[PDB]
UniProtKB/Swiss-Prot annotation:
Its EC number is 3.4.23.22. The active site is at D35, S199. This is Endothiapepsin. Keywords: Aspartyl protease, Disulfide bond, Hydrolase, Protease, Signal, Zymogen. It comes from Cryphonectria parasitica.
Length: 330
């Protein structure tokens, strides 16, 4: 089997991407944030505290003839941005882009933190990291991909995120028309539960490539590119007037600037992030200070190849017995 679903930016900055997901019978379609940095499929629901729902579409398990309470199971998750959610668990039929999993754990939120309530466009998350990170207790549950894997034509999924445009998540096949050149594959460590890999270096603009190992995670659920402070300083030094602002929370730059590209290495291959992709717009409405899309990972404890980086590539998440990642230009 295969599946193929379009993923759509939630706003004009590509802050996140939503993908329609069919849950239950008859289907209830919710727009979920596919997150290769976490491993829970959780949804706003008829059980979510009413004051914490503000415009999201909810899953109502009592209206699904295939829903079953997973008795005794609870979940609770905290994300790297400080947000969180928790609740109980149902199993139900879940379909993405025509690919159906029966008996998928659907984690129903009883509580969500304010950042989720305040974002009416995201109805929940669909985790695509390794199932060792799933938070369901006392019986850990498998991700949608883990449940689907054995049925797929090939044990892979691909992320093809658009810049200011829709893109595609495919399951079970590589679309050889979706990228240019060849796909370069690189080793993955699953020891922390992430799609963790080592970039071979970077360049700023038209500058020389610096060969240096940068361990980090491929994380579709993180907006920005978080790299070591040395790398980030080297980038922003090429933007007149850019500076790190402790009050804003990162590097800012004059909105009048033209940003240089940023290149990262994948083996001997190179992925170029155009300068435009690094502009996250005014820090507040009407400001002439703009927020940068490359930020320091110091204090986060891991480097994160978030959407800024991933949307410059066609990315293969190869879930074979020994997982690997692939990157191609597009």
């Amino acid at each position: 089997s295969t599946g193929s679903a379009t993923t759509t930016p939630i706003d004009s900055l590509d802050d996140a991407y939503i993908t329609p997901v069919q849950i239950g019978t008859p289907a209830q379609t919710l727009n979920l944030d596919f997150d290769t940095g976490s491993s829970d499929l959780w949804v706003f629901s008829s059980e979510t505290t009413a004051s914490e729902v503000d415009g999201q579409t909810i899953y109502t398990p009592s209206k699904s003839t295939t829903a079953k309470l997973l008795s005794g199971a609870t979940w609770s998750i905290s994300y790297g941005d400080g947000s969180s959610s928790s609740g109980d668990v149902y199993t139900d039929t879940v379909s993405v882009g025509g690919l159906t999993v029966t008996g998928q754990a659907v984690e129903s939120a009883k509580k969500v933190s304010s950042s989720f309530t305040e974002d009416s466009t995201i109805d929940g998350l669909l985790g695509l990291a390794f199932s060792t990170l799933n938070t369901v207790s006392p019986t850990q549950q498998k991700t949608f991909f883990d449940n689907a894997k054995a049925s797929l034509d090939s044990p892979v999924f691909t992320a093809d995120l658009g810049y200011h445009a829709p893109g595609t998540y495919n399951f079970g096949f590589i679309d050889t028309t979706a990228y240019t050149g060849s796909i370069t594959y690189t080793a993955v460590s699953t020891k922390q539960g992430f799609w963790e890999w080592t970039s071979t270096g970077y360049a700023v603009g038209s500058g020389t490539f610096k060969s240096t190992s940068i361990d980090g995670i491929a994380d579709t659920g993180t907006t920005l590119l978080y790299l070591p402070a040395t790398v980030v300083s080297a980038y922003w030094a090429q933007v007149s007037g850019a500076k790190s602002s402790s009050s804003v929370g990162g590097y800012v730059f004059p909105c009048s600037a033209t940003l240089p590209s940023f290149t990262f290495g994948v083996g001997s291959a190179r992925i170029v992030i155009p300068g435009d992709y690094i502009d996250f717009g005014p820090i507040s409405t009407g400001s002439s200070s703009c927020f940068g899309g490359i930020q320091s990972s110091a204090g986060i404890g891991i480097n994160i190849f978030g959407d800024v980086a991933l949307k410059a590539a066609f990315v293969v998440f190869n879930g074979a017995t020994t997982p690997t990642l692939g990157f191609a230009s597009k």
